[PDB]
mmCIF file of C-alpha atoms in Angstrom:
data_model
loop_
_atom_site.group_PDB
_atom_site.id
_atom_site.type_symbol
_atom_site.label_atom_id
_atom_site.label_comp_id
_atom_site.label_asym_id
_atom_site.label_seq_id
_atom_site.Cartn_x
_atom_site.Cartn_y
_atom_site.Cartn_z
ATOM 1 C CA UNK A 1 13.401 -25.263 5.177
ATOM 2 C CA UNK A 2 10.299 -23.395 6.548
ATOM 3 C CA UNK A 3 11.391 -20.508 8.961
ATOM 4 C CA UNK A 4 14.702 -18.702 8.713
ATOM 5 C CA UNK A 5 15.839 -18.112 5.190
ATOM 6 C CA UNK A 6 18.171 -15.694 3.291
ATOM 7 C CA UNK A 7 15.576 -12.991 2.925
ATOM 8 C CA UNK A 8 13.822 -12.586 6.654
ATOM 9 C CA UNK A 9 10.711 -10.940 4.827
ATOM 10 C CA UNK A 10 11.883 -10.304 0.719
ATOM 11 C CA UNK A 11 15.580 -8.987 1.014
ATOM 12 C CA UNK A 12 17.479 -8.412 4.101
ATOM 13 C CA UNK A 13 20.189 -10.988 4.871
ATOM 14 C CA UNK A 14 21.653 -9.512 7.888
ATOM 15 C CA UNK A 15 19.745 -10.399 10.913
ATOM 16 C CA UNK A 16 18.551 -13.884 12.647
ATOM 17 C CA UNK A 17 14.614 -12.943 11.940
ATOM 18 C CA UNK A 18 12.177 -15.685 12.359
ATOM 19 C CA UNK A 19 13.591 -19.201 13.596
ATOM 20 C CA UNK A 20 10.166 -21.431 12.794
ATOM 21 C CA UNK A 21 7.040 -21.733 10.242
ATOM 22 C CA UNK A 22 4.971 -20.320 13.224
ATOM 23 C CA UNK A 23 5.544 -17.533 15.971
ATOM 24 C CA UNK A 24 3.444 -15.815 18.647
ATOM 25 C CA UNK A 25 6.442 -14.279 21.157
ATOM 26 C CA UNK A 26 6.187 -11.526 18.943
ATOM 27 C CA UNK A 27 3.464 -8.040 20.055
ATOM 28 C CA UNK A 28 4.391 -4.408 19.227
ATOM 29 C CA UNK A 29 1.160 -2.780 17.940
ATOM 30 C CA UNK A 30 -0.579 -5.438 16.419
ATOM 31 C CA UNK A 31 0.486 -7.148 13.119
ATOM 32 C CA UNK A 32 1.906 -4.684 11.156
ATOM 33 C CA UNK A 33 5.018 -2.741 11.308
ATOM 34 C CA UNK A 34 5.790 1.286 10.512
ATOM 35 C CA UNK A 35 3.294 1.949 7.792
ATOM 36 C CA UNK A 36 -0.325 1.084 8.392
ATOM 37 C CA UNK A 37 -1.754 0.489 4.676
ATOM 38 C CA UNK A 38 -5.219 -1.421 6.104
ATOM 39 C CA UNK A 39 -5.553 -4.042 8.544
ATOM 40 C CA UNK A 40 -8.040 -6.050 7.312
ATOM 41 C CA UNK A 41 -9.111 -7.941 3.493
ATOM 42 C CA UNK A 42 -11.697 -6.412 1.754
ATOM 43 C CA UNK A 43 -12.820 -4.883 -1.322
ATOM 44 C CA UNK A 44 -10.851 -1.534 -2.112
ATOM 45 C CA UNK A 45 -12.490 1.380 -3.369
ATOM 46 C CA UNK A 46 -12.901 1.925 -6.860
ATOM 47 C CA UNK A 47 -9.353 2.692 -8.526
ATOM 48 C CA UNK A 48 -8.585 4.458 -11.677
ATOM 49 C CA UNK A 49 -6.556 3.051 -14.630
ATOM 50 C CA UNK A 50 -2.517 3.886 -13.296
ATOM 51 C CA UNK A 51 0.367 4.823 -15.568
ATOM 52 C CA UNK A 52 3.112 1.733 -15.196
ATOM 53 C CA UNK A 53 5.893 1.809 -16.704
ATOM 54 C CA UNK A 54 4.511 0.348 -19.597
ATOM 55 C CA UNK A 55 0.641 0.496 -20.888
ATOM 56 C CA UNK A 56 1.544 -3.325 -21.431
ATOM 57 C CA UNK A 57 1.805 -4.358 -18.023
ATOM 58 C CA UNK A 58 -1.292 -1.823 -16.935
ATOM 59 C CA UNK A 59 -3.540 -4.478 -18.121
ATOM 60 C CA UNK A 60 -2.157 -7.088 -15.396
ATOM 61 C CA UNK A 61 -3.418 -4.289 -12.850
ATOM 62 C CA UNK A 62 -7.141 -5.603 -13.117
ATOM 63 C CA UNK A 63 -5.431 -9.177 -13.127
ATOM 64 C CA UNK A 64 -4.363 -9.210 -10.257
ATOM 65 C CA UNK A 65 -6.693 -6.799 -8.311
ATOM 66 C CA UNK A 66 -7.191 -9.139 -5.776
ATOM 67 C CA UNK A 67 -3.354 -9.746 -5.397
ATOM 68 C CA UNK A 68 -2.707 -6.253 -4.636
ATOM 69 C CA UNK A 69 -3.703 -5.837 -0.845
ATOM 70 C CA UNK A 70 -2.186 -2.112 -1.242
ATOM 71 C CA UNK A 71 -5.164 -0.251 0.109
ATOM 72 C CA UNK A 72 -5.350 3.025 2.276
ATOM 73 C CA UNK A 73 -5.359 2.853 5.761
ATOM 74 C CA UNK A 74 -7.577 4.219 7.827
ATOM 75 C CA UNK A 75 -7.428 7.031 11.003
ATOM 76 C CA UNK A 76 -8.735 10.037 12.435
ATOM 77 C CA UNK A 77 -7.358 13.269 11.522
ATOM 78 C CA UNK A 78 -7.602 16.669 10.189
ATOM 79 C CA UNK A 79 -4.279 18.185 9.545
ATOM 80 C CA UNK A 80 -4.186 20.014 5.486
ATOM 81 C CA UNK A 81 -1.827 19.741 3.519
ATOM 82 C CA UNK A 82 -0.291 19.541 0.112
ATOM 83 C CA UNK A 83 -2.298 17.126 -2.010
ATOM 84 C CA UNK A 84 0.551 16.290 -4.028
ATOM 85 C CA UNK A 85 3.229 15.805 -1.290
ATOM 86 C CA UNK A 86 0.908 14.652 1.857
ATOM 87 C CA UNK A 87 -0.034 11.845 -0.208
ATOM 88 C CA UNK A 88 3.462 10.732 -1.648
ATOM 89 C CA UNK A 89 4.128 9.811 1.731
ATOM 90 C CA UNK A 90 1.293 7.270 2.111
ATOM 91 C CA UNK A 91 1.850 5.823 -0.714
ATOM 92 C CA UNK A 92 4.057 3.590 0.829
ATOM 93 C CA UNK A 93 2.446 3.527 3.673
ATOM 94 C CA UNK A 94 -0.454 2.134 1.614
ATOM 95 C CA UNK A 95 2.352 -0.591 -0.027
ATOM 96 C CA UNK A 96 3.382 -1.847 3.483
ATOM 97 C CA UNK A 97 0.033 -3.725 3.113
ATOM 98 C CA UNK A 98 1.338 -5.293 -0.030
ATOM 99 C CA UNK A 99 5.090 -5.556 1.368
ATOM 100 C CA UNK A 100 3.979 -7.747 4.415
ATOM 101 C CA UNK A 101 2.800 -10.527 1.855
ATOM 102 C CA UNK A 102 6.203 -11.016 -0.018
ATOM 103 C CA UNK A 103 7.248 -12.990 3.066
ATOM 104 C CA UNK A 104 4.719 -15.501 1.355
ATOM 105 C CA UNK A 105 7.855 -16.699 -0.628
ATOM 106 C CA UNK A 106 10.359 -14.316 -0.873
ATOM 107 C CA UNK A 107 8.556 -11.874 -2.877
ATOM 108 C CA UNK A 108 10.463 -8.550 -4.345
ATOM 109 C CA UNK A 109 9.691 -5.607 -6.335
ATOM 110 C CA UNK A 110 11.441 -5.002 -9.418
ATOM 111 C CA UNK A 111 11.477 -1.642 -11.995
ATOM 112 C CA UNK A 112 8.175 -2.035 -13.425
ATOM 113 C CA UNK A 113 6.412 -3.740 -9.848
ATOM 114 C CA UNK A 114 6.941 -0.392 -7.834
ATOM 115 C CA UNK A 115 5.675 1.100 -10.643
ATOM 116 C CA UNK A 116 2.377 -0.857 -10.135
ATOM 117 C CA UNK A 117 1.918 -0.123 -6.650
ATOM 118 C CA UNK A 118 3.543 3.682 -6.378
ATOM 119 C CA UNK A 119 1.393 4.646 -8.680
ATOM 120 C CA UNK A 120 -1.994 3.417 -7.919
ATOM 121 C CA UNK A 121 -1.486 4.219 -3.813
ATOM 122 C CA UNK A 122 -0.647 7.510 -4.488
ATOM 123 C CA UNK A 123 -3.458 8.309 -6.900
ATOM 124 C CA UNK A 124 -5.219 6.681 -4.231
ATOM 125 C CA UNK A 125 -3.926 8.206 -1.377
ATOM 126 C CA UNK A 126 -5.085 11.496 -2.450
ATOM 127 C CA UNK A 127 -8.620 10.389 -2.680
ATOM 128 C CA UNK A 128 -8.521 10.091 1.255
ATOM 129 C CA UNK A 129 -7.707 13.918 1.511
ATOM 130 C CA UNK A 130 -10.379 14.268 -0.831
ATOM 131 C CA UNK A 131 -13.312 12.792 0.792
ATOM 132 C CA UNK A 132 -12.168 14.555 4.191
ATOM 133 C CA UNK A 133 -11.984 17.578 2.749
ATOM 134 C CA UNK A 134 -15.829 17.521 1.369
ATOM 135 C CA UNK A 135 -17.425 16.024 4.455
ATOM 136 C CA UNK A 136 -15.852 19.206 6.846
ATOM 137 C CA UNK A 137 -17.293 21.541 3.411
ATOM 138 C CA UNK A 138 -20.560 20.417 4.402
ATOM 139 C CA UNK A 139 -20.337 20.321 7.792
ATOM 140 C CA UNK A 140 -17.958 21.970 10.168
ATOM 141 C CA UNK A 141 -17.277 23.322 13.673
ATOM 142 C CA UNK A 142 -14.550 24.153 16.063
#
């Protein structure tokens, strides 16, 4: 049956969550929920090779590039930080993206699947603190 099942979005059996295929009662800040991780689906930004939990299932990475909506989100800011613990913090805010599709079927993450995603957000994430960083270098004031 379409529209209420044992997960209500990947695994969460506890509350009543969706009753059809279809809904539209539902308007809080958009689509999304907590984490931002994108809005929209394009290309991501060129990614390095990531370190999963096995070099074995690395090479899946590239295969399924264009299943792996986990790409950084986007919003004006300025705050600095630490580069290593800033970023571990959208990491999963980059995943959400890629969270909000298991619903497709039930989807989950197992050992080596956060591993995937953890990784490559994070290496990722710190690229956005990177390219902020250079454009106030070259320009700056008040």
């Amino acid at each position: 049956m379409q529209g209420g099942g044992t997960h209500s979005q990947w695994n969460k059996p506890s509350k009543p969550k969706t009753n059809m295929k279809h809904m539209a009662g539902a308007a809080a800040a958009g689509a999304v929920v907590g984490g931002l991780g994108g809005y929209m689906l394009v290309s991501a930004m060129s990614r390095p090779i990531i370190h999963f939990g096995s070099d074995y299932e690395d090479r899946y990475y590239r295969e399924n590039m264009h299943r792996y909506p986990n790409q950084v989100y986007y919003r004006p800011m300025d705050e600095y930080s630490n580069q290593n613990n800033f970023v571990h913090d959208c990491v999963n805010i980059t995943i959400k993206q890629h969270t909000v599709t298991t619903t497709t079927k039930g989807e989950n993450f197992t050992e080596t699947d956060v591993k995937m995603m953890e990784r490559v957000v994070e290496q990722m994430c710190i690229t956005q603190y990177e390219r902020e960083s250079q454009a106030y270098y070259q320009r700056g004031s008040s």
